[PDB]
């Protein structure tokens, strides 16, 4: 049951936009809302509006009086001397709650005229006509106007609606909540050479009487919220999908072949999401818009998605196909379960984010294989356990503070830190995988189909929300639908992993009792760490003995420590028979390293990742080597690679080398075995016999049979030896000698890989392989032996580093004349120049990176150069570079770059709270408090980034370096 927090119900909204002026960055328009009051004596009506100048408001064609105030413009007063962050977080939460449409509130308060009170008490319709104007919007809707001359279509100027969550208040007045569903009528009067893309279906396109402008009329009969309404106006090249004909793809001019190749996969994503769920795609059209200077890499609205143009690749670009493919896939998953089925509160957001991430993981499983699915699930689980042990924990479904261990309030999406938002979505889809583990996948897809079917029977009624609230899901409704389809309720699993905000830590060690033939496990939990919680459920453990692989369920109550499980025979060591594996197959194992008295080959605690856990198991090194070689699970091979770094014995070198030589191993395991072999090789110097690690293996796999030092000409058509070939010198360059100087045998090998590179014969580009070669050249740089702080000149230039510097100069200059993809070689060469500057080789001068961080460059070059400037101002304690970065945060045209500068200055801070630095003035405290209070008031993501930066630099209490 859904009861509105608003005293009115909104039925229909007309959004008309005229006069989109690109020179002056200005729109004019009106908005006409059709509300039905649910309570008599409605009097004031409270709507949401930011940055719009409200000209006049007429209610039922009668002139009404409005008052506007935004408490989130300046959160605390300018003349308050408070400088602690808990004060700002409480004031910011109160300010966002005072404009919240999820309460009854709002920023624009319109007073109903007196003569309509007899029209409002007996509950009859009210039609509110506001007309407004955006004069020059800061972060409302982004105007990308290039400075080439010509007409606005000839120079490539466009507008798009940017922002996250409820940010539609930034460009027209609305009820900007996800729970106020209404039908829509959208008119946009644009230039005749431009096209206006929006939500709904385009019913017509009429000309103006001078035929210089045309009006696009859109209609949206599926009741969506105001927060799902978008807009993209530009000189877009239109491409109808040749497979599905209601899907149109819009790109920027001159990028039509890239659009043709890139969006050619999307019909398979549509077919997948419509056959695992049994509902068809709910909207009547689908539109993909590719734009410049995007807010996020992929945004999903109702019947529309806005991607950045940096996803567009051609047919000869690999290492970008899978990333763009999965961006399209998660946009479509959010089309199904973020835009059609919406949220009922700010709680129950974990339901929608979990269903979106879970069905996108099912797509990844079918498309890229179960092994890529397991690797992705393991990397997300490692991400969450790192974040939750780092700071507190992520609390899905809080109850309204519920989480007081962090520095922000979790009551609203616009007060969350961006890393918390990312980890929120990550934990939501892993908890949905856990619900699939308890209640099987076909029942899970039946739950999702029942939600979609209730929403689509709701979506066709005309009753103003008598039935339109069946399109809003809640937690209680989701659990009730689960209990309807399965008969089991998941309330212990919901109580543990949703309502409780923690992950578990397992420390395991075993001992084999030879007398009674048992395996005595010893599993203890660390439940006193700040991020942890105590697990009391069951726990699966998989033991591989000589007779095969056996699963055991252990009951781990609070007082439990020793778990005795039984062991089988050892009669497959009496005769040589094959040892049967986890799957149905069996292999020949070399049992010379195994103990004579124990049959068990390896043990895995929680193999299926059925809890949110971090396992620290103490096996013997031969058990880790057997688990690396003969396991049929990629997460166990990865964890054995990760645990073999502590055992540098030559049997582990043989194990990793046999993994590296082995095709029919998953390629991301071999790419990890490269770096593990490099670390082991660095640890057993003065024992290593022959050549450096992986060199003979590289010449055996990727070089000519007649010439060992000449590499084969590039043929990248295998896509697994391409990735292994481009990752093996990067790990080979980490080879550390006894003198701590990289062997001139590996550096010469990398330089010969660079010289003899011929790419005139493959059908794929070479930009990522050459960029990884520059990364391998940067990995070989050891710190220089400066004497008496000698000024770095050409007289003291290392003879090794002169070759590296010549190569990166040649590569960067050739990129200036012939570029590649993603400007990968510019990014790699800027990263390598920063590596050479971090050691004492090149003079520590930020002027090159400051010239590459200007506005007109590509955004990857910009963020690489700004990462170099952030690293410089951390190491050299530069005041003027920090003022340069803070000025660039305040006034840069691209807001993604501002968010990225705040993000990088949070990750690599110039000082922490423990450090005494010269940069801890009262002036810097006043600048960052002014940046939290004012200055970042227009983005909701810069303000949370400024809160994160103030927390990283000065902590939760009063800045110490202050009177």
């Amino acid at each position: 049951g859904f009861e509105s927090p608003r005293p009115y119900k909104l039925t229909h909204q007309v959004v008309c936009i005229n006069n989109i002026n690109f020179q002056r960055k200005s729109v004019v328009g009106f908005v006409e809302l059709t509300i039905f009051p649910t309570v008599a004596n409605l009097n004031r009506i409270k709507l949401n509006s930011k940055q719009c100048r409200i000209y006049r408001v007429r209610i039922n064609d009668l002139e009404a009086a409005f008052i506007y105030n935004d408490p989130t413009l300046e959160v605390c007063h300018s003349e308050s001397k408070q400088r602690n962050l808990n004060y700002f977080s409480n004031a910011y939460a109160a300010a966002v709650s005072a404009v919240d449409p999820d309460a009854g509130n709002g920023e624009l308060c319109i007073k109903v005229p007196s003569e309509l009170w007899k029209h409002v008490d007996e509950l009859k319709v009210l039609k509110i006509h506001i007309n407004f104007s955006l004069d020059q919007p800061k972060g409302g809707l982004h105007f990308v106007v290039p400075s080439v001359e010509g007409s606005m279509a000839e120079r490539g100027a466009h507008v798009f609606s940017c922002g996250y969550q409820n940010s539609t208040r930034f460009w027209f007045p609305c009820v900007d909540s996800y729970s106020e569903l209404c039908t829509w009528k959208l008119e946009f009067t644009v230039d005749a050479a431009m096209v206006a893309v929006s939500n709904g279906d385009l019913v017509e396109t009429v000309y103006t009487h001078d035929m210089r402008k045309k009006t696009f009329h859109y209609m949206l009969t599926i009741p969506t919220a105001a927060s799902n309404i978008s807009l993209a106006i530009g000189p877009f090249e239109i491409l109808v999908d040749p497979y599905m004909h209601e899907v149109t793809h819009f790109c920027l001019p001159q990028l039509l072949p890239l659009l043709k190749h890139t969006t050619s996969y999307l019909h398979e994503v549509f077919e997948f999401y419509e056959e695992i769920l049994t509902c068809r795609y709910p909207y009547s059209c689908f539109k993909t818009v590719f734009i410049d200077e995007a807010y996020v890499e992929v945004a999903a609205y109702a019947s529309m998605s806005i991607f950045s143009t940096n996803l567009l690749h051609s047919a000869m670009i690999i290492d970008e196909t899978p990333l763009t493919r999965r961006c399209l896939a998660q946009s479509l998953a959010q089309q199904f379960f973020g835009c059609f089925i919406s949220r009922m509160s700010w709680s129950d957001e974990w339901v929608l984010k979990g269903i979106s991430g879970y069905i996108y993981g099912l797509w990844m499983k079918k498309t890229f294989g179960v092994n890529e699915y397991r690797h992705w699930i393991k990397e997300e689980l490692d991400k969450i356990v790192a974040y939750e042990l780092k700071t507190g924990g992520v609390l899905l479904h809080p109850i309204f503070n519920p989480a007081s261990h962090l520095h922000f309030s979790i009551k609203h999406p616009h007060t969350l830190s961006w890393e918390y938002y990312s980890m929120f979505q990550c934990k939501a889809h892993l908890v949905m995988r856990l619900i699939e583990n308890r209640i099987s996948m076909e029942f899970m897809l039946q739950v999702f189909n029942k939600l979609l079917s209730l929403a689509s029977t709701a979506s066709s009624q005309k009753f103003q929300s008598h039935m339109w609230s069946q399109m809003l899901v809640s937690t209680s409704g989701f659990l009730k639908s689960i209990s309807n389809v399965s008969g089991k309720d998941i309330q212990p699993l919901i109580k543990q992993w949703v309502d409780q905000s923690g992950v578990v830590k397992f420390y395991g060690s075993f001992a084999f009792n030879r007398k009674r033939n048992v395996l005595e496990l010893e599993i203890k939990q660390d439940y006193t760490s700040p991020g942890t919680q105590k697990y009391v459920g069951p726990l699966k453990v998989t033991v591989q003995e000589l007779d095969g692989s056996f699963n055991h369920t252990l009951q781990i109550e609070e007082n439990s420590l020793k778990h005795d499980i039984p062991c089988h025979s050892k009669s497959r060591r009496n005769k040589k028979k094959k040892i049967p594996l986890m799957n149905g197959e069996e292999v020949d194992m070399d049992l010379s390293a195994m103990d004579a008295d124990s049959p068990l080959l390896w043990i895995r605690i929680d193999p299926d990742m059925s809890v949110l856990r971090k396992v620290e198991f103490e096996q013997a090194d031969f058990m880790w080597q057997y688990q690396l070689r003969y396991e049929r699970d990629v997460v166990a091979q990865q964890e054995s690679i990760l645990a073999l770094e502590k055992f540098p014995t030559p049997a582990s070198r043989l194990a990793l080398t046999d993994i590296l030589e082995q095709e029919q191993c998953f390629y991301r395991v071999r790419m990890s075995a490269c770096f593990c072999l490099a670390k082991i090789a660095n640890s057993m110097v003065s024992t290593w016999t022959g050549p450096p690690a992986m060199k003979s293996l590289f010449t055996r796999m990727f070089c000519c049979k007649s010439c060992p030092n000449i590499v084969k000409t590039n043929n990248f058509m295998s896509f697994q030896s391409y990735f292994l070939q481009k990752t093996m010198p990067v790990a080979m360059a980490l080879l550390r000698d006894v003198h701590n100087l990289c062997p001139k045998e590996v550096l010469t090998f990398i330089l010969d890989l660079i010289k003899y590179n011929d790419n005139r014969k493959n059908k794929f580009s070479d930009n990522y392989y050459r960029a990884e070669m520059i990364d391998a050249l940067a990995n070989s740089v050891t710190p220089a032996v400066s004497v008496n702080n000698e000024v770095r000149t050409l007289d003291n230039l290392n003879p090794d580093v002169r070759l590296i510097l010549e190569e990166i100069t040649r590569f960067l200059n050739m990129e200036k004349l012939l570029p590649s993809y993603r400007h990968t070689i510019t990014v790699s060469c800027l990263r390598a120049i920063r590596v050479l500057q971090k050691n004492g080789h090149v003079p520590s001068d930020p002027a090159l990176f400051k010239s590459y961080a200007e506005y007109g460059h590509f955004v990857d070059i910009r963020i690489a150069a700004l990462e170099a400037v952030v690293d410089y101002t951390k190491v050299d304690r530069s005041y003027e570079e920090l003022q340069w970065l803070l000025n660039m945060i305040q006034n840069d045209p691209v807001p993604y770059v501002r968010h990225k500068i705040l993000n990088m200055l949070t990750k690599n801070p110039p000082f922490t709270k423990n450090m005494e630095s010269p940069l801890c003035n009262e002036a810097l405290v006043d600048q960052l408090w002014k940046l939290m209070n004012s200055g970042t008031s227009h983005d909701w993501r810069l303000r949370c980034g400024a809160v994160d930066l103030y927390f990283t630099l000065f902590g939760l209490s009063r800045p110490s370096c202050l009177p």
Binding site: S314, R822, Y852, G856, V859
Partner: peptide, 25 residues
Amino acid sequence: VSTFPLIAARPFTIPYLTALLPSEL
């Protein structure tokens, strides 16, 4: 300037066009 000269880093207008686009196809 004689030894190791670097071409100076020049600002463009649309950097994604010179980054992402392939030149030999």
